[PDB]
Amino acid sequence: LSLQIDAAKVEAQNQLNAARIAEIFNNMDLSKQSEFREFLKTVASFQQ
Amino acid sequence: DRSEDARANAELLLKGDEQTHKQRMDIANILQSQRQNQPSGSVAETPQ
Incomplete structure (x- = not known):
């Protein structure tokens, strides 16, 4: 009984870690995507 | 810039x-005054 409840707490931490990973990496993709708009803004100035 | x-x-x-x-x-x-100087100075004398 005591071994089952201890292992259940560890399993719950992997779920909370997975919740952060989906959110935090989504914002990290958007960090790079918004940086490409600044790169394109430089190229458009050069061609003008 | x-x-x-x-x-x-x-x-x-x-x-x-x-x-x-x-x-x-x-x-x-310059050329118009250069051609006109020579007949003018042939009357007496004039600088350009």
């Missing part, structure tokens, strides 16, 4: 059109 540099290209081009006309007008009056 590149926007104002673009505007500057047009101003350099306008000076290019202007400087050609400046070369046409100035040279025309």
Whole structure:
């Protein structure tokens, strides 16, 4: 009984870690995507 | 910088059109006074 409840707490931490990973990496993709708009803004100035 | 540099290209081009006309007008009056000096100075004398 005591071994089952201890292992259940560890399993719950992997779920909370997975919740952060989906959110935090989504914002990290958007960090790079918004940086490409600044790169394109430089190229458009050069061609003008 | 590149926007104002673009505007500057047009101003350099306008000076290019202007400087050609400046070369046409100035040279025309030098040569016109050069041909007229010789018959005038044949009457008596005159500097150019």
